[PDB]
Design a protein around this ligand. Structure first.
Ligand SMILES: *C/C=C/[C@H]1O[C@@H](n2cnc3c(N)ncnc32)[C@H](O)[C@@H]1O
Ligand SMILES: *C/C=C/[C@H]1O[C@@H](n2cnc3c(N)ncnc32)[C@H](O)[C@@H]1O
Ligand SMILES: *C/C=C/[C@H]1O[C@@H](n2cnc3c(N)ncnc32)[C@H](O)[C@@H]1O
Ligand SMILES: *C/C=C/[C@H]1O[C@@H](n2cnc3c(N)ncnc32)[C@H](O)[C@@H]1O
Lengths: 360, 10, 343, 343, 360, 10, 10, 10
């Protein structure tokens, strides 16, 4: 199948085993922003579902299928590849919906949907939108979408922005400098220091931050799920031309994403921006191995290139230069091995952000 | 990755 | 090979991917009690190494081989299956020990050592000792051991004792009670309340605890690595009969382990006990879905059974019974999927 | 020279011996708020530096000069009197900024700069702002300043507010009560109880405190570094008239300071206030030997007087008076001998 | 004067200003081991003081003078160079002892004692015994000691021992590795890293430790204050030949000292050993820049050479080698700039010290 | 499992 | 004084 | 040095 060709079996095993746990489902359902927005997007576009046929890709607990039923769907085909599919079949029986929701255990690329649906609902967003490569499974499912059918979500908007966070950057060398001692229990570890630095810099940082660490308005790259094909997500070239609004050391690029459910009645937005309430996707920042000096009025240009891998993720290549000085910087990161930095502390504003006397 | 979805505190 | 049969690939891939990260090495080496105790045990027993042939099973960054080299070892075969082997080679070259430490990449069940060895050193202890199923690889390396050969560590004592911790029981129980809701966004989740409770309590809890919560003297089950063979660890049956010292709700069993380096000069112990300085192994507590009430002086008997699985871990089965009342508690736990509680 | 007259040698020796230690540099540079705010203020106002001539007074390791260099400065004269100057040179050479940053060792009151400068940058703030008497060296460097020249920082606001802290008062009072003993090993120390109380309360207390202990809006005394001259800081008379917002014992005055980098593009503030993130300056509290009782709405007037001494510090004199009752409190404090309470 | 010749005025100023504070006196008097032992050593050797003439060098608060009076001394000359001398004159007046204790403000090398005393009492011990170079002032005072007079304390015993403390050693590089980052706020600090390492290693560590970190019985170097002359303390060569009892990495040499008050009645000991209750002198450890591997049964030989400086302290040179391997190690330390590491935590025993199962 | 050895704070 | 700038924990 | 005698806690 198409899924088997692009995924090493070792990746799918650990992947779907993860999603088999009700503790992981619960974590997602308890995300009020995620679950509430999906509920509103469906129930408030009830004409898009009333008496419609619905395909729920990666239904998990089937919670989205129940919202489709709550909106008046006629038949709902709920596809789930993890062993969560049997827990959803329990929910469907006990909610007395066996006549309207049909749980189909298996990967959407492998099951035989019997018919064509009028609308496809799914939650295929990984962190940085593209992780887990479920977007392709969401696009693959369009083989069951009747012509003139809809996709919930309809579009996805990944936002890039350059940030400054000296503490985040200096944390990398602080940790790797463990190896820079000549007599750790009598062993000289220093030869491995450069490797430790490279390892920590290959890691995207998954946490949140204060908006004021950004130094330029965000650049938005848009995937239209109604138009995009599977192969479009294998190579994702995201050119950027940021205009600096703040002077400082650029330490990397911050990422977040929004999706819009463009219904016949109203368009509902689910946004993981740093402006909005925190969601379980947080935000992701990619450091630069070497920071770039840029003043307000310079242009930071470069490309962010995402190359899908057989581990259901993306290899990230970020090149960036300050056009006025030519000083450039590269970095490669493994989206599959992020660093979960979030501690719960409300993010601190960058130093030197007080323009009036705080003592006043 | 190990944890596709991250834990969000309640 | 021996490894590839008891290990399905998707577990071995994710397993050795984990140890290929230097950050995970740093975490183990920065464990001062662990790293310092290993060095003390080797240096203090330096003639178990002086001009001897050493096999280092799962050498990681090679820190154990360097200790054996400091002790005066003639040759040291440091075997490592993760990509960390390449980082071990760099440290051997930069410490000018190319003439003594030979990094041999691969799984010890698969590699081909040039000669038999006098002593094997390794850190094959997972949390609760038996996780990772690396003790089997450790015992499997005895095929390269001389007859009078030694093992470092030599034995491992796993200690279990019943505990009371209503805070921890309530914490896991209330988590599963999310699935008690009759109307989560209008969706009745109650039917899965069963399955959720079984799931959350299938997880051993990994953190530290004050010993005041232990209600009886610990039971000890010893594994002697000189005398055990690989197949002995496929099934570990640990009977227990606890004489209760305090009344109260028994919420489960608390696990920790000790290992002993029985050398020619002195025996040196490494202990993960709750009274000892904290280590990256912490301790392990297995919760009862429903706790058992025991009076001070009652007897709590049962059996803790460990069956090895293909995921390089164990299916834990704990049955506990207050003999004075017949209050029984049957529990299944998945050692490979623990809940890391420590903050 | 100007420095050697207002500074007796034994103070200057111990003073510059202190800044010659890299560990004391690391402590200042690891102050993220301090180092980050200085960089923000310089980079954000980059054209106050672009192709300009910069004088860095007391450059330490040179971190400010590097910020001025990043901002685009043409030439930067980094002056440093401690042996740290040699470490600044090494960083200039290894950052390939030999063509832009010129380390000139010596005291700024003594060195000979080749040309006048457009902007002076420095960190001349001691705890309570005025300690170290380095603001005088900062103002003294204005002799190299062009007419339209700028100062970074430009001004300093010192804030004082009355506080209540019975825990701190009792802590210092009980310390001095050691000398109340009539029979310490049979020796009557009571005669020195006076002298001990005066000594312990002569020390300003340096730590942080929650703002809930402040009983009135802070008074502000501003020093404008563009307009002040060296001699202005020999005597600092700060009147205050506090309208009390809460009843209770006034145990003394709490001091903190702000400095402002008034550039061409934006003003950036660095604040050591008790509501702001902690910095290595902390805050300073001056205790009353006997506290004053004030009711909510009473007025607490007086004067805080700072007379510069030869030990590169100030003799503080605080008289505080509850106007409604005439309850007066006269205090002498030695800024150079503070009590570092923070733990 | 002799004191002026060997002390830079800047050193004496900060030195005696320190001792002018009653808070510093109080800290010393509240040392129960220090004050109690001195009291016992004097009152329990009452024949050494009864109707005797006493000289109290560096009396401070004059507390030792009061013990001499409590023992029945006829006249006590109490010499104090700091401004504490006037606080002691207050104590003498208010204790109604102006006829038996005479406070003489000034340095013992400069005042005119009018007569010769039968006994000299002082507390001239700095940390590592020799810091502050007050021992020489104590020996200088022997110009007033009648022939066949006594010295309280009579002898001093500095003990050396090699220790192992990987955490202490690794702390040095952890702190200096601050400089080993290429972009600290855009600055490469790494060129200063080696200097930071050298700075931290020039510092003696003043705290306490568990006895089990020692790896060989202590070597004792003895100064007899009745025989020693001033010039003997200008250069202090302390040869050592330790026999290792434990295998491990030697990270330096630990120091502590004892003094004995050898009275006509009984000899009273004041010991700052790690075996004994903590005193305000603590203990002092001098690291090695490079640790030395030694097994139980090797010999660690070398010299500790102390060279007095004009800052009232000593430059410390420690050379040491493992004879069986020839591997040696040097280190230079400034005794005047120690590192006060004590935190209050009861010292941890070295790892691998459990010979029986702790779980038993 | 996912993380055989657990992170230990320093 | 003795220590003009005070130690700040990191 | 700066502090000839060290502080001992009471
Ligand atoms: C982020 C949510 C993931 C959910 O969707 C399921 N899932 C992922 N990938 C597939 C494919 N290819 N087919 C069916 N279901 C899929 C995950 O198991 C999870 O429940
Ligand atoms: C707990 C420590 C694990 C270390 O040992 C390595 N390791 C595990 N399993 C094996 C086998 N079978 N052969 C060689 N090395 C092994 C881990 O990679 C880790 O470094
Ligand atoms: C608070 C920062 C002090 C830094 O400035 C240096 N410094 C103090 N006083 C002077 C004078 N008069 N000239 C030059 N540099 C001075 C200190 O050494 C420290 O680095
Ligand atoms: C450790 C105790 C020191 C006390 O003795 C005083 N002191 C030091 N050095 C001298 C000299 N040369 N003459 C008289 N008194 C001295 C210190 O002031 C302190 O009280």
């Amino acid at each position: 199948s198409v899924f088997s060709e692009r995924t090493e079996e070792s990746s799918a095993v650990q992947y779907f085993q993860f999603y088999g746990y009700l503790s992981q489902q619960q974590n997602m359902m308890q995300d009020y922003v995620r679950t509430g927005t999906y509920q509103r997007a469906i129930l408030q576009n009830h004409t898009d579902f009333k008496d419609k046929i619905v395909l729920d890709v990666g239904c998990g607990s089937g919670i989205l299928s129940f919202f489709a039923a709550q909106a008046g769907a006629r038949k709902i085909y709920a596809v789930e590849a993890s062993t969560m599919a049997q827990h959803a079949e329990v929910l469907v029986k006990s909610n007395n919906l066996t006549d309207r929701i049909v749980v189909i255990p298996g990967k959407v690329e492998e099951v035989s949907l019997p018919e064509q649906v009028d609308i496809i609902i799914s939650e295929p967003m990984g962190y940085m939108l593209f992780n887990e490569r479920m977007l392709e499974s969401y696009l693959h499912a369009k083989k069951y979408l009747k012509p003139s059918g809809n996709m919930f979500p309809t579009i996805g908007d990944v936002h890039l922005a350059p940030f400054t966070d000296e503490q985040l950057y200096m944390e990398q060398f602080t940790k790797a400098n463990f190896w820079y001692q000549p007599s750790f229990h009598g062993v000289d570890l220093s030869a491995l220091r450069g490797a430790a630095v490279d390892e920590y810099f290959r890691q995207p940082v998954v946490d949140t931050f204060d908006i004021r660490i950004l130094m330029a308005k965000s650049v938005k790259y848009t995937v239209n799920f109604l138009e995009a094909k599977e192969g479009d997500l294998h190579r994702i070239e995201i050119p950027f031309k940021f205009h600096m609004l703040h002077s400082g050391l650029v330490h990397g690029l911050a990422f977040w994403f929004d999706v819009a459910f463009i219904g016949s009645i109203m368009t509902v937005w689910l946004s993981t921006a740093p402006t909005e309430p925190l969601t379980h996707w947080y935000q992701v920042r990619c450091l630069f191995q070497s920071p770039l000096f840029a003043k307000a009025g310079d242009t930071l240009s470069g490309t962010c290139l995402l190359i899908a891998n057989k581990r259901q993720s993306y290899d990230i290549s970020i090149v960036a230069q300050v056009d006025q000085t030519g000083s450039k910087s590269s970095n490669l990161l493994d989206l599959k091995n992020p660093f979960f930095r979030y501690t719960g502390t409300t993010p601190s504003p960058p130093p030197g952000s007080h323009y009036t006397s705080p003592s006043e | 990755g190990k944890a596709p979805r991250k834990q969000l505190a309640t």
